[PDB]
Amino acid sequence: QSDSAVLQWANQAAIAAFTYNFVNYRDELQASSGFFTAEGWDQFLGALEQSNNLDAVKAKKLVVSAVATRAPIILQKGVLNGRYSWRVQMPILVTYQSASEFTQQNNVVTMLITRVSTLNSPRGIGISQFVVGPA
């Protein structure tokens, strides 16, 4: 598990979460579940639920897409609760658009990636915590 291996793996992860539309959101959602640890997935869902973004896309029939504003960094790394973790951070530009609309947001995604058995996640690592903020 390289630091760069985790960084990129964390790069796809973030962008994937903001790549879906009102037509396929269920496939896209469920697809990116491998990216997450057992609880990181529960956390990610709970966060989705609380946000409306999804209801917005479904309602206004939008196509979400995102791109990395800057390169992802590792704020801190090392053992957290007997599991080696990386706290990766990266800004993105989300683009909620349709035939009628076109919005953009500047977001900062922060993920806690930890090590996990390859018997459940062939990669070896997983997002234990996915957290979005503005600017």
Author numbering: 73 to 207
Question: What is written in the article reporting this PDB entry?
Answer:
DotI is a 23 kDa inner membrane protein essential for intracellular growth of L. pneumophila within mammalian and protozoan cells. DotI has one transmembrane domain in its N-terminal region, followed by a periplasmic domain13. DotI is conserved in all of the identified type IVB secretion systems, including the conjugation systems of R64 and related plasmids. Structural analysis of the periplasmic domains of DotI and its R64 ortholog TraM demonstrated that DotI and TraM are structural homologs of the T4ASS protein VirB8.
DotIC crystallized in two distinct forms (Form I and Form II) under different conditions. The structure model of Form I (space group: P21212) was refined to a resolution of 2.2 Å with the working R and the free R factor of 19.1% and 23.5%, respectively, and Form II (space group: I432) to a resolution of 3.5 Å with the working R and the free R factor of 17.9% and 21.6%, respectively. Form I and Form II contain eight and four molecules in its asymmetric unit, respectively, and the structures of these molecules are almost identical. DotIC is a single domain protein composed of four helices (α1 - α4) in one half and one β-sheet in the other half. The octameric rings are also present in the Form II crystal. The four molecules in the asymmetric unit of Form II are arranged as a stack of a quarter of the ring, and the crystallographic four-fold axis produces a stack of two octameric rings. The oligomerization of DotIC is also observed in solution. Although DotIC is in a monomeric state during purification, an oligomeric peak appears in size exclusion chromatography under the crystallization condition. SEC-MALS measurement showed that the apparent molecular weight of the oligomer is 263 kDa, which is consistent with the molecular weight of the stack of two octameric rings. This evidence suggests that octameric ring formation is not a crystal packing artifact, but instead an intrinsic property of the DotIC molecule.
